[PDB]
Design an enzyme around this catalytic site. Structure first.
Site, short mmCIF file in Angstrom:
data_model
loop_
_atom_site.label_atom_id
_atom_site.label_comp_id
_atom_site.label_asym_id
_atom_site.label_seq_id
_atom_site.Cartn_x
_atom_site.Cartn_y
_atom_site.Cartn_z
N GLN A 172 0.15 -6.25 5.19
CA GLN A 172 -0.69 -6.02 4.18
C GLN A 172 -0.79 -7.21 3.12
O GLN A 172 -1.49 -7.34 2.11
CB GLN A 172 -0.20 -4.61 3.09
CG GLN A 172 1.06 -4.75 2.46
CD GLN A 172 1.58 -3.69 2.04
OE1 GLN A 172 2.09 -2.87 2.91
NE2 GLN A 172 1.32 -3.44 0.77
N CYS A 223 -0.49 -0.43 0.82
CA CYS A 223 0.16 0.51 1.86
C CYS A 223 -0.69 1.80 2.22
O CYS A 223 -0.47 2.04 3.26
CB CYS A 223 1.67 0.66 1.37
SG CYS A 223 1.71 1.44 -0.12
N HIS A 244 6.09 3.87 -1.41
CA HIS A 244 5.55 3.15 -0.30
C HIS A 244 5.12 3.98 0.63
O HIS A 244 5.80 5.06 1.10
CB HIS A 244 6.56 2.12 0.13
CG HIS A 244 6.09 1.22 1.04
ND1 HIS A 244 5.25 0.37 0.99
CD2 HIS A 244 6.51 0.74 2.33
CE1 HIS A 244 5.06 -0.23 1.95
NE2 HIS A 244 5.84 0.00 2.87
N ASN A 290 5.75 0.30 9.64
CA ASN A 290 5.54 -0.22 8.59
C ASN A 290 4.16 -1.43 8.31
O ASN A 290 4.06 -1.89 9.52
CB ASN A 290 6.85 -0.93 7.72
CG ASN A 290 6.88 -1.30 6.44
OD1 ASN A 290 6.05 -0.81 5.61
ND2 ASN A 290 7.96 -1.99 5.87
#
Length: 212
Positions: A19, A25, A159, A175
């Site tokens: 990102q 996120c 997150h 992630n």
């Protein structure tokens, strides 16, 4: 449900993304779930656009943060483009959905997993990838390089990521910090500790897209 699930092995997970400095996120998390449910329903794995959610979900705050549930609601109502049509730029710009033509995919709704319930989350993961949140502010999470992560961390979730599998003592998470973080971009977080919030608050707020 099985003892081990890994949606990567079933061809339902695209490569790991980064990102960058943008607080997007929430969009990355939502897109992982769309990529997964479309593969499960149609047999085709495609990449979809984080950028479009960043630009077009006006309930979220672009690179200053947002809400996976609002991004998923947007896809259920309007739809979403392919990543190659609407690629990631790492900055919020104007919503360009219309100028880019017809949407590539559309969902039918959104559902929340019952919170603070490990079994409920595993059941959902066994059916499809799920959007989950955790506390990522701590240095231990930031410097994670591998293994089953147990913390330290608190439950002040900040997150959004995506759960794409689990095993006897962990949940497998994709992630959006690039391939150099963690286990080639993934983290295995401990489960089964009896903490109802989950390790790092993992069971706090989990959503998945519905598609008939």
């Amino acid at each position: 449900i099985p003892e081990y699930v890994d949606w990567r092995q079933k061809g339902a997970v695209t490569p790991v993304k980064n990102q960058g400095s943008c607080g997007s996120c929430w969009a990355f998390s939502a897109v992982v779930t769309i990529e997964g449910i479309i593969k499960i329903r149609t047999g085709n794995l495609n990449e979809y656009s984080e950028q479009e959610l960043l630009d077009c979900d006006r309930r979220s705050y672009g690179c200053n943060g947002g809400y996976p549930w609002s991004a998923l609601q947007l896809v259920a109502q309007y739809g979403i483009h392919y990543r190659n049509t609407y690629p990631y730029e790492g900055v919020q710009r104007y919503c360009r959905s219309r100028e880019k033509g017809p949407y590539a995919a559309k969902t039918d709704g959104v559902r929340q997993v019952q919170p603070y319930n490990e079994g409920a989350l595993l059941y959902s993961i066994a059916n499809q990838p799920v959007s989950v949140v955790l506390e990522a502010a701590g240095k231990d999470f930031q410097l994670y390089r591998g293994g089953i992560f147990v913390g330290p961390c608190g439950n002040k979730v900040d997150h959004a990521v995506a759960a794409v599998g689990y095993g006897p003592n962990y949940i497998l998470i994709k992630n959006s910090w690039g391939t150099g973080w963690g286990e080639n971009g993934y983290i295995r977080i401990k489960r089964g500790t009896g903490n109802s919030y989950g390790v790092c608050g993992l069971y706090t707020s989990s959503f998945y897209p519905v598609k008939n």
